[PDB]
Motif scaffolding. Structure first.
Motif, PDB file in Angstrom:
ATOM      1  N   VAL A   1       0.898  -1.159  -0.013  1.00 45.57           N
ATOM      2  CA  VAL A   1       0.102   0.037   0.038  1.00 45.57           C
ATOM      3  C   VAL A   1       0.781   1.360  -0.014  1.00 45.57           C
ATOM      4  O   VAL A   1       0.477   2.228  -0.730  1.00 45.57           O
ATOM      5  CB  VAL A   1      -1.083  -0.050   1.249  1.00 45.57           C
ATOM      6  CG1 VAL A   1      -1.943   1.229   1.025  1.00 45.57           C
ATOM      7  CG2 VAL A   1      -1.882  -1.109   0.715  1.00 45.57           C
TER       8      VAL A   1
ATOM      9  N   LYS B   1      -0.351   6.581  -6.034  1.00 47.45           N
ATOM     10  CA  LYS B   1      -1.445   7.630  -5.545  1.00 47.45           C
ATOM     11  C   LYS B   1      -0.816   7.966  -3.909  1.00 47.45           C
ATOM     12  O   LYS B   1      -1.472   9.183  -3.546  1.00 47.45           O
ATOM     13  CB  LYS B   1      -2.737   7.135  -5.425  1.00 47.45           C
ATOM     14  CG  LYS B   1      -3.199   6.052  -4.701  1.00 47.45           C
ATOM     15  CD  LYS B   1      -4.609   5.417  -4.536  1.00 47.45           C
ATOM     16  CE  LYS B   1      -4.756   4.667  -3.450  1.00 47.45           C
ATOM     17  NZ  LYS B   1      -6.441   4.400  -3.316  1.00 47.45           N
ATOM     18  N   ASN B   2       0.126   7.381  -3.319  1.00 49.62           N
ATOM     19  CA  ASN B   2       0.674   7.764  -2.147  1.00 49.62           C
ATOM     20  C   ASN B   2       2.099   8.294  -1.922  1.00 49.62           C
ATOM     21  O   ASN B   2       2.442   8.546  -0.779  1.00 49.62           O
ATOM     22  CB  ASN B   2       0.650   6.326  -1.038  1.00 49.62           C
ATOM     23  CG  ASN B   2      -0.831   5.926  -0.863  1.00 49.62           C
ATOM     24  OD1 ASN B   2      -1.865   6.746  -0.618  1.00 49.62           O
ATOM     25  ND2 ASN B   2      -1.062   4.479  -0.875  1.00 49.62           N
TER      26      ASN B   2
ATOM     27  N   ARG C   1       2.505  10.984   0.480  1.00 46.14           N
ATOM     28  CA  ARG C   1       1.976  10.899   1.783  1.00 46.14           C
ATOM     29  C   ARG C   1       3.250  10.168   2.637  1.00 46.14           C
ATOM     30  O   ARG C   1       3.060   9.915   3.923  1.00 46.14           O
ATOM     31  CB  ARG C   1       0.942   9.783   1.842  1.00 46.14           C
ATOM     32  CG  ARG C   1      -0.394  10.656   1.448  1.00 46.14           C
ATOM     33  CD  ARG C   1      -1.667   9.701   1.379  1.00 46.14           C
ATOM     34  NE  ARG C   1      -2.763  10.384   1.000  1.00 46.14           N
ATOM     35  CZ  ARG C   1      -4.084  10.299   1.255  1.00 46.14           C
ATOM     36  NH1 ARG C   1      -4.283   9.127   2.390  1.00 46.14           N
ATOM     37  NH2 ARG C   1      -5.057  11.130   0.859  1.00 46.14           N
TER      38      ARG C   1
ATOM     39  N   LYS D   1      -5.080   2.200   9.429  1.00 48.78           N
ATOM     40  CA  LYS D   1      -6.114   2.805   8.291  1.00 48.78           C
ATOM     41  C   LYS D   1      -6.899   4.004   8.781  1.00 48.78           C
ATOM     42  O   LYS D   1      -7.700   3.944   9.843  1.00 48.78           O
ATOM     43  CB  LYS D   1      -7.226   1.617   7.881  1.00 48.78           C
ATOM     44  CG  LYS D   1      -6.131   0.285   7.394  1.00 48.78           C
ATOM     45  CD  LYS D   1      -7.074  -0.790   6.861  1.00 48.78           C
ATOM     46  CE  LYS D   1      -5.986  -2.155   6.694  1.00 48.78           C
ATOM     47  NZ  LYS D   1      -6.899  -3.242   6.096  1.00 48.78           N
TER      48      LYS D   1
ATOM     49  N   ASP E   1     -12.235   7.221   0.211  1.00 49.55           N
ATOM     50  CA  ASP E   1     -11.478   7.702  -0.640  1.00 49.55           C
ATOM     51  C   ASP E   1      -9.947   7.058  -0.753  1.00 49.55           C
ATOM     52  O   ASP E   1      -9.709   6.255  -1.667  1.00 49.55           O
ATOM     53  CB  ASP E   1     -11.279   9.260  -0.342  1.00 49.55           C
ATOM     54  CG  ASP E   1     -10.446  10.169  -1.359  1.00 49.55           C
ATOM     55  OD1 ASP E   1      -9.966   9.563  -2.473  1.00 49.55           O
ATOM     56  OD2 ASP E   1     -10.003  11.329  -0.776  1.00 49.55           O
ATOM     57  N   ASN E   2      -8.985   7.244   0.435  1.00 50.88           N
ATOM     58  CA  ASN E   2      -7.802   6.858   0.283  1.00 50.88           C
ATOM     59  C   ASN E   2      -7.487   6.662   1.770  1.00 50.88           C
ATOM     60  O   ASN E   2      -7.369   7.716   2.484  1.00 50.88           O
ATOM     61  CB  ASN E   2      -6.789   7.525  -0.460  1.00 50.88           C
ATOM     62  CG  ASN E   2      -5.376   7.216  -0.244  1.00 50.88           C
ATOM     63  OD1 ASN E   2      -5.082   6.217   0.427  1.00 50.88           O
ATOM     64  ND2 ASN E   2      -4.538   8.021  -1.114  1.00 50.88           N
ATOM     65  N   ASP E   3      -7.287   5.258   2.318  1.00 47.71           N
ATOM     66  CA  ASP E   3      -7.307   5.090   3.858  1.00 47.71           C
ATOM     67  C   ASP E   3      -5.535   5.120   4.279  1.00 47.71           C
ATOM     68  O   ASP E   3      -5.334   4.603   5.537  1.00 47.71           O
ATOM     69  CB  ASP E   3      -7.752   3.843   4.259  1.00 47.71           C
ATOM     70  CG  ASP E   3      -7.225   2.586   3.729  1.00 47.71           C
ATOM     71  OD1 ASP E   3      -5.962   2.794   3.114  1.00 47.71           O
ATOM     72  OD2 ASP E   3      -7.772   1.318   3.796  1.00 47.71           O
ATOM     73  N   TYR E   4      -4.714   5.571   3.650  1.00 45.93           N
ATOM     74  CA  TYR E   4      -3.257   5.462   3.864  1.00 45.93           C
ATOM     75  C   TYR E   4      -2.738   6.719   4.736  1.00 45.93           C
ATOM     76  O   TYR E   4      -2.806   7.622   4.132  1.00 45.93           O
ATOM     77  CB  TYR E   4      -2.519   5.422   2.584  1.00 45.93           C
ATOM     78  CG  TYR E   4      -1.066   5.149   2.733  1.00 45.93           C
ATOM     79  CD1 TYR E   4      -0.464   3.996   3.292  1.00 45.93           C
ATOM     80  CD2 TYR E   4      -0.050   6.143   2.693  1.00 45.93           C
ATOM     81  CE1 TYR E   4       0.748   3.979   3.700  1.00 45.93           C
ATOM     82  CE2 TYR E   4       1.533   5.966   3.054  1.00 45.93           C
ATOM     83  CZ  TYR E   4       1.675   4.889   3.467  1.00 45.93           C
ATOM     84  OH  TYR E   4       2.857   4.557   3.863  1.00 45.93           O
TER      85      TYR E   4
ATOM     86  N   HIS F   1      -4.848  14.254   8.119  1.00 40.68           N
ATOM     87  CA  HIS F   1      -4.601  12.991   8.038  1.00 40.68           C
ATOM     88  C   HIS F   1      -4.293  12.509   9.685  1.00 40.68           C
ATOM     89  O   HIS F   1      -4.723  11.577  10.364  1.00 40.68           O
ATOM     90  CB  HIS F   1      -3.703  12.216   6.919  1.00 40.68           C
ATOM     91  CG  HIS F   1      -4.116  12.235   5.721  1.00 40.68           C
ATOM     92  ND1 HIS F   1      -3.243  12.508   4.663  1.00 40.68           N
ATOM     93  CD2 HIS F   1      -5.530  12.926   5.076  1.00 40.68           C
ATOM     94  CE1 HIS F   1      -3.834  12.759   3.659  1.00 40.68           C
ATOM     95  NE2 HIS F   1      -5.333  13.173   3.755  1.00 40.68           N
TER      96      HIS F   1
END
Ligand SMILES: FC(F)(F)[C@@H]1CCNCCN1
Length: 284
Positions: free
Chosen positions: A34, A39-40, A43, A58, A63-66, A94
């Motif tokens: 992950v 997309k991360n 992050r 999580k 949407d995005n749980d990262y 986040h």
């Protein structure tokens, strides 16, 4: 083998580097798929520091749980910690969402915002009572309530408000401000004082969600904090505290997050802190 004797034996032989590399060689290797999705990429502070998929925290959204955060669960010690990176400009919301969702009471910060002339983490909390912070991506409000500044550490009281439900909670911010730019502290005395202040607050206790611990990468200083805590707790529970094997505790913790304890000097400092702390409470 009493760790104090093991300590003097490694120091006299000067084998700290050799012990440390044996730990690195035996450490667990689990997938981080992950963390490496494209997309991360923004992050993650560091390309070489990722949470394992099996232990990652999580976020509660579709949407995005990262987030770059791991749950370290110590079974015999009965303690849980969340270890995370210093938040980034696009992950401040986040971070506070995770604090809310996991029901944490405390945040432990082991770095300064600037060290060695570079930014190590975002200014993620308010500096003045009358200038609160709103995180629009996650619908949270954060207010400074009070600030107690000491020589080695600052404690702040914060109010976190879930703007969706209008619930509020008190979060304690424990900020260790004197870890040096290079190396480790010469004495573990002020680090141990700080750990006992976090404990006294209730932040490490089972009536709350896990404490959130960070430095810049969330593995070095952060690793020292949870390894020392867990080792001293085990010494208060076991019939023989000398049975407590710090290298074995570190390998267990490394099943949950990679790279905990970054240097042979951090390993030596972790031994020093546990040896000295055991005295703090050893008919003392
Ligand atoms: F690894 C062990 F040394 F065996 C223990 C036991 C269990 N709790 C966390 C770490 N310490």
């Amino acid at each position: 083998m009493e760790m104090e004797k093991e300590f003097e034996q490694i120091d006299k032989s000067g084998s700290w580097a050799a012990i440390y590399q044996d730990i690195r060689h035996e450490a667990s290797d689990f997938p981080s798929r992950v963390a490496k999705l494209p997309k991360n990429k923004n992050r993650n502070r560091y390309r070489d520091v990722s949470p394992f998929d099996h232990s990652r925290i999580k976020l509660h959204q579709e949407d995005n749980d990262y987030i770059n955060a791991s749950l370290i669960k110590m079974e015999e010690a009965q303690r849980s910690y969340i270890l995370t990176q210093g938040p980034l400009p696009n992950t401040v919301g986040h971070f506070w969402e995770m604090v809310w969702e996991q029901k944490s009471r405390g945040v432990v910060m082991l770095n300064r915002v600037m060290e060695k002339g570079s930014l190590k983490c975002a200014q993620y909390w308010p500096q003045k009572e009358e200038k609160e912070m709103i995180f629009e991506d996650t619908n949270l409000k954060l207010t400074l309530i009070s600030e107690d500044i000491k020589s080695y550490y600052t404690v702040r009281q914060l109010e976190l408000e879930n703007l969706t439900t209008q619930e509020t909670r008190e979060i304690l911010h424990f900020h260790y401000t004197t870890w040096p730019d290079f190396g480790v502290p010469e004495s573990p005395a002020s680090f141990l004082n700080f750990l006992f202040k976090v404990r006294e607050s209730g932040s490490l206790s089972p009536e709350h969600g896990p404490v959130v611990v960070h430095c810049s990468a969330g593995i070095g200083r952060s690793g020292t904090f949870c390894l020392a805590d867990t080792c001293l707790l085990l010494m208060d529970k076991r019939k023989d505290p000398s049975s407590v094997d710090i290298k074995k505790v570190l390998l267990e913790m490394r099943k949950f997050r990679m790279g905990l304890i970054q240097t042979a000097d951090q390993l030596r400092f972790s031994y020093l802190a546990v040896i000295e702390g055991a005295k703090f409470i050893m008919g003392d």
